[model samples]
Structure formats: C-alpha cells, structure tokens
Target: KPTIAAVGGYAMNNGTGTTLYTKAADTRRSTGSTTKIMTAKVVLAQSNLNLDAKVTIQKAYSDYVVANNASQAHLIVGDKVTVRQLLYGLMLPSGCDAAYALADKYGSGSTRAARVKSFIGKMNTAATNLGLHNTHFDSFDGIGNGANYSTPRDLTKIASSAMKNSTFRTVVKTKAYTAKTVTKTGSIRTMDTWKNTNGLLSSYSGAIGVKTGSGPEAKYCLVFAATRGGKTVIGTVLASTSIPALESDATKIMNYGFAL
Candidate 1:
C-alpha cells in the first residue's frame, strides 16, 4: 500500500473496469466540481448530439455564479456559445455558468428551474444505470444542496465510463481552449482562454485528463487518469487536505496501480 494523505478515500482501476486498488472506496463524501465529469458525460450521451449547436448565454447563469462565488468561464450574456465550447468551459475552468447553460439546454421542461431539476434527475439516472448505488446528485454542478455525494469507487468508475467517449477524452486532456462565439449583435467575439485546473497534466508525464474539485465540506478532491505504455489508470481521491496533498495522493495511487 502506498502512503497517502488523510483523505476520505481512494480507488483505482484500469480503463475497462478492473479495480486495482481501493481504501474506504465505498464511503460517500461531498464531490465538489468533480461532479462535472458526469455532467459532461450525460451531455455527450445525448442521441445525435450536435456539438456545434449554439446556446444563448443567459443572465441567470451569470448571476448564479456571482451569488455562489463559483468558478466560471466569464461567459457574456446573450452570446451564442456552442455546446462544444461550453464543454470546454465547464471542464477547463470548472464553470458553473456553463453547467447551468447545458442543463437548461438539454433538460426537458417548460421552465428553467424545472429543466435544472430534470437535468439533475438525468444525472441520478445515469448514476443508477452505471450501478453506482453510493452516488446521488442534487445539482448539475457539484454545488450541492446537501444531497450531492459519491464514493471514491463510484467516481473512479464514472471517470472510466466517461473516458470511453472520444469527445470527453479529447476535452478533458486539453490544457487550455479558446472559443470564438457569436455576440448578441451578430459579431464574432474571442473569449479568454480557459485553462484546465488539473495541475497533474503538466507535472505528470502521461497524465491525460479527469477533473479537480474542492469545497468547505468536500475539502480537496480529484479524479485523475493517465496512460503509460498503452495501459490506462483511473482513480479518485476525495476529501484531501489541500491541492498539493490531493495531487500527491493521486500520484501515489497511480504509481501503485501501474506497478500492480
């Protein structure tokens, strides 16, 4: 066993669902922004998804970010951003605004609140479909309303399932992305470049994608994946003490997983 920090739990597996290591893997804890992995996964699972399809930015999305002090992509109201670009925003910058837009765009309902509720329902249903009994989502973005949580084992599995999608794979692995959107006035606008928060991408030789998360209750969390010599290792570390501790814990697990 590798020496790790005082985290809630940790779990590792190969891309195809083989569990390589785990400790308190089934214990549920707050997930933080790492929940966006499923948000992006559910979006990509849509039938006949048109990545280029555009969604007009709304004021409510921006307001939500401000009210909650959440991370964002700094999306401008009324700009027409594509679904593809929103994915980059959601993952790269951990944008809550981008998440709200996606939930509003894809959820089935007549009202925005209902649509957000329905989108969260989709997230729970996706979790159920994956046989993750310990996971449940009450919000699209990991800004939970007291009912959002998942275990290390469940999260690792979720990332593995998400990584199978080529689009999700491409988006998460990217270090940064710049999007050109159509302004409300019918002009082109080049948005600021969104950078991935997962620092391991630059520090680790084979590090690919996944996500990073933290909060008052969730502490520091990370869902990390990397490939070496064609073998992939995916895992999660939840409730870590800090950002450096989270990455170090993940690194220890990945190194152990690969050695196994």
Candidate 2:
C-alpha cells in the first residue's frame, strides 16, 4: 500500500536536489512533538539570541510532568542557563517549559477568530508567508490544542524553508550540542545537551536534517531531508501510525524524490 508523487519545485537541491514529496496529506492533525520546530524558527527569526546566553529557570520550566513519568530533561526551577541552552532543551528534549519560555518572549500573532496566541500566531503567519495555507498552529508544542494542524505538503515546505536559515539548519542538523552555563551568573555547568530524535537522520543513510511529529489526530507525520549522490531530497508522510512504519514510508517516498 505505497503511493508516490512529484514535480518541478524539486530542482534547486538546497541541502544536498529538491524533489519534495507528500501523500494525501490533510491539514487537521495534532502536531505531536515536532511542534518545537516552529519554536526554533521563531527564536531564530526574532533576534540574534545566542545559544550560549543564560537565564534563571522560571518556575514553569520544570520536569513536573515527568514526575508522573512525563518526558523531561531534569530541569529544576531556580536553575540558570542561556537562551541557547534552553533552545536545546526546547528542541532536543522537546520541553514544554522551553515552549513556554520562547512563547512568553515571542508569542504574539494573528488576533482573528481562531485567537491563536503569540507562538501559534507566529506559526500561522509564518505558514502564510511560506504559502502553506494547509497549515495551522494552536499551540507552542504542536500537541492537541484542538487546532494545531498541518498537511504533509505544508510541513515539508515549512521544514525546507526553515533550513534556509543557516543558523536554523545548524540547530536542527546537529546530532548533539552542549548547553553551557559558562556565560551565566555562575561558572560553566552542563544545563543542556540534545540528541536528535529524527530517526531518519541517524538511521537512514544520507538523512541529515528536519524534525518529526505525531499525536492523536496527527498520527505519524514526518518532515525529513537527505543528501544522496550529490543531490538533496525532501520527504513527508501523514498519519504513519507508528515510528517504524513512518520511517519506512518516509524512506520509500524520499527514495522516489531522490531518484528523480
């Protein structure tokens, strides 16, 4: 049960050729964890926020969820680190606290009927700027906020657009990076370190960049890019059901794009 499709926008090869891929992707799904990608984009676009910058942990930036076995990076309140460190904490670890922090700083967007807050609003505006009409943002972390949604086509386009920012690409492409406390109120302490979750980047040969997301409505959606034979190809999959299945489907679709 595999379906593949393609065309002309797939020519530039920005990362490595450009035959982007998509399925019958819809725009109404939960964003899952990949929502952090939008957070990274907003931070990079807003200002020259250095990754090495530091800040005291806000009470909200805690692993409170993980206490009951939620995902967390052990970031306790009253701790301090740079915005850069928090970024890694945000994207790499996919911290909701990171989302709150960034959103707190830059969460102001469309004030239409949807009433998308700053973070989600910026995501919406960015989606429009990128011409991704099929996308929507209702939360900072791409989880189920009832309307945080995107189509496979729109997400891949957004991912590719995001990579255009050299700095943005660096953050997403890195497998692991240090979260230093060097520039903070105290001596250098390890506060952030990120190991990428894009299984395609580490597992599938040539896969180098992008992010992943899945949730109740979103199912198994992925936005990925790879460089092969001196060419780069982007891929997307909607509603994969499982990571392995998602990976397999993405690889298959991407192979077609690369081959073209």
Candidate 3:
C-alpha cells in the first residue's frame, strides 16, 4: 500500500525475522560494494595471506583498462601488492580490480577478471561449508554478470561468525588505516588511510561495524551491527531506493532492538 521502502514489501530486520518488532530487514536485489564484504570474509578465512601478502598486478589489471573500477585502491599492473593493502582496496576503495584480482589469483588462475566467478563460488562455498544457510554467492564482485546474493540477516550472521575470529572484528571495525602501494619504480606510494563504506560507523554513535550495498536493481541494503551497554545487535535492510526512507526504516529497526 504505502511505498515506504522497497517496491512491494515492508522493511524487516534479521535476528527476530518473524517478530514484527524484530523481523529481518534483508531484502533482495543486485547490491554493489556490499558484495565485497563476503569476498573479504572468504579471502581472510581461506588464505591467511599475510595482511602483507605481496601481489604483483599483471597487464590485464591495467589502470585504464579496468577504469570502470574507479575507486581502485592504488593497484597498477607490475606493481607489488599486499594483503593488508588489498584489504583497503577491497573495503575502503571498493576496487573491482581488487575483487577481480583476488578472485582470479586465489581462484587457481590469473583470470584477470575473465570468468573469475569460480572465485565467488569460493565465497558461497565458505558460507555453505560453514552451514550459513542464509548466504550464497554467484559473483565475487557483485557487479555486472554476477548472481551473487546474500541477505542482511545472513551477512550479519557471517560477520558475527567471523567476529568470533579475532581478525575479522579488527579488520571490519577498523575505520581508517594506511595501506602502502608499490610503484613501477620499485618504490611505494603511501595511499594514506581510507574510509569504510558503512556510513553508520562514522555517522551513528552506537554503530560498531557494518557493510552497505546498493545498485539500480538492488536499491539500498545494509548489514549493520551495534553495541550499547554491552548489548550487541546486528541487522540487515534490503532493496530500497530512498536514502531517507532506508535511513528511517533502518533507524526504526535498530531502535526497536535497542529498546529491548
């Protein structure tokens, strides 16, 4: 009736998915950078790739070629990269190249963005392997040609599950961290520190850790977490077009849980 958020539904949160007060907020659509969250978790788990793991970009990962990946985290062909650096690339800058590279590199071949989907399968596999029934992945980057998908509820579970692992919380919750990049001259560029996509951490007081996603088809979705007085809450909101509407619906969802 009322087009508050999504086209044909009401907003719901994940934990208390059934209860109106705590119903899940995960809606479905082609989300954007949020896809990287899954990628991050999977990569971190599979390869304890030294956060300083070094990677050298190939010609295929050329800057101008993958420019569609505008928010690149200082990656260029022939440049040596590191895991900690790629972390910033994947999360802070949300680089499609970083996603492509990681997927391809870790996926068995130097796919260089050519059919790196099997990499995404790794993410889905990780979730399923862990019995995270709510999560699945068809693409690693969550961009064009990917069937990758997950619910905020599932993602919250994924993040929380990973949080139990010391590394995940520290990495995800990290607001801004410096990452170095190697240059063609065998030198390094100080990429400086980067910011996280989840707005809640910077804008909201109680916010702890989270991931955000949106696209024309996906609209707006977010997997958010918060802690207040030692009460930890996790949530997800899916498929929305309106920022203010999503914010309103999300705030309502969070307030409901915190009140309890």
Candidate 4:
C-alpha cells in the first residue's frame, strides 16, 4: 500500500468495494493504456458484433501509429484482419493502431476523423452510463492527446462492469494470440504473435487480466484482479514508480482486500 498512491477493491459481493487502502481514490489520474478496457467494452456492446468479420487495414491506422510513435501490433496496411484479431491486438500488445481500426470501423461518421471522434464519444457515453463521473476518454488508445483520465475507484467500477462480458473476460485472461489475416495479395500474413502486457497472469496465482498502463504523465498504473480462497478481489493503482512496484502494490491489495 505504501508503494503506490491509490488502492481500492470489492470482495465477490461485499458492498460496492471499500477503500480500505487509499491516498486519493476519487482523484482523477491519467490512465495510459488501461483506457483500452473501455474501448474493448464499447466495441463488445455494439449490436450484432461480428468478431470474425474482416476489417481491412487502412493507411490511416498505420499513420496514427507513426504520428504518435505509439505501441502497435505492426498491422500491415491492406491486410484483412478480423474484429476478434484486432481485439487481441488491442488488449494484448496495447496496440493503438488496432484501436484506431476498431474505432473507425465501429464508429459512425462521414470521415475517418469524424468516426474516431464519434468512437471516443461512445466511450464517454459508456462512462456516463456506468455513472463514472471521474472517467473520460479523448483517444481510442490510452495515448490521450491531453484529456484522458480516471480515478482509482472509478476505474475499478469500469473494470468490474467490463468483466461481465464473457468475450471480454476471455480476451483479457488470454496470455497470447496469433492472428491469421489475409494480405491484399491473397497470401497469408504469418503474423507475429501478440502477448498480454499485464504481468499478473504469470507472476500472481489466480490472477486474471484487467489491463496495464504507463506514460510520461501517468507513470506506471495497473488495474488487476485475482481469485483465491473462495474470494475475488480487483483493484487499481496509479502513478507507481515502476512496474514491479505496480505489481507489488496490486498483490498487496488483493491480499488485503480478500482479508477484509
């Protein structure tokens, strides 16, 4: 608890989680890649989602990666990747390009810019629906242009809501995935496999995913969960000094939360 700034959790069914641990649970902080939690949620919420349908990779997606120098799945332009594959890329590698692709495909508008804006709008709308006043998204990827932020308590609620979807639960829990997409030339692109960045899966027993985030402004942040001894605890920590510290803080709270 001393290693991080904010910590909160809910037992399998105890009241809406108590912040037995906290520095500023309600205060908003930059979310970094953890913002993808809601991105995937919004996509899954869409009516008649076709996880297997192909979405052709566009130049704008690749261009966004280059412009922002953000994380990527190295998705080749002209490739026809499925929505399922893009979800894997978005969650596993924290690919901003994959996020852009999904946002563009699912969001409605006359142009790419308009569609992306619309997608981010959907994200905000979801947050409002969840009653998360402290959460907001200005970018599909957590590389917030300037305004993406969420509080620890608010993020925990978001994660809890996201866990209700079976597909979302599976995606986050998966350790790695390899997508087989069709290239423009009709040949297969033996894609490089995508691996999850959330370290709890490997290091902490019973640890299921949520997501990870870090940036110059956000520092190291983690939204994590684990089930043990007939109890499950989920929580978030923001602005920790390093990744180890983030995990350390999470582990501590998971244990503490279960005991509480």
Model 4 CA RMSD to the hidden true structure, in angstroms = 2.2
Residue lDDT tens for model 4, 1-260? 34443343222322345555665778888888889889999999999799988999999899898888788899999999999999999999889899999999889899988999999999999999998888988998879496999988888888888888999889988998998889999998889889999999999999887888876677788888777776667778888877887787788777777667
Top lDDT model: 1
lDDT of 3 by residue, 105-224 (tens): 677544545446567667777778767665556667676454656655566566666556566666667778776678778888776667776667766668766666665456676766
Clashes of each: 0, 15, 10, 0
TM-score (C-alpha) between model 4 and the true structure? 0.93
- Residue 145, model 2: lDDT of 55
**Model 4, backbone clash pairs (residues 3+ apart or across chains), number:** 0
lDDT agreement with native, every candidate: 0.88, 0.63, 0.63, 0.83
Could you give candidate 1's per-residue lDDT for residues 1-260 as a string of tens digits? 88778455565556456777777888988898889999999999989689999999999999998987788999999999999999999999899999999999898899999998999999999999999999989889888465889999899888889998999999999999999999999999998899999999999879996899866677789999999998888889888877888888888888888888
Q: Candidate 1, clashing residue pairs? A: none
Better of 1 and 4 by TM-score: 1
By summed lDDT, which 10 consecutive residues of candidate 1 come out lowest?
6-15
**Which portions of model 1 show Cα errors greater than 4 Å?**
none
lDDT of 4 at 108: 88
Residue pairs of candidate 3 with colliding backbone atoms: 12-24, 12-25, 13-23, 13-24, 13-25, 14-24, 16-22, 17-24, 51-84, 138-148
TM-score winner among the candidates?
1
Give the number of colliding residue pairs in candidate 1: 0
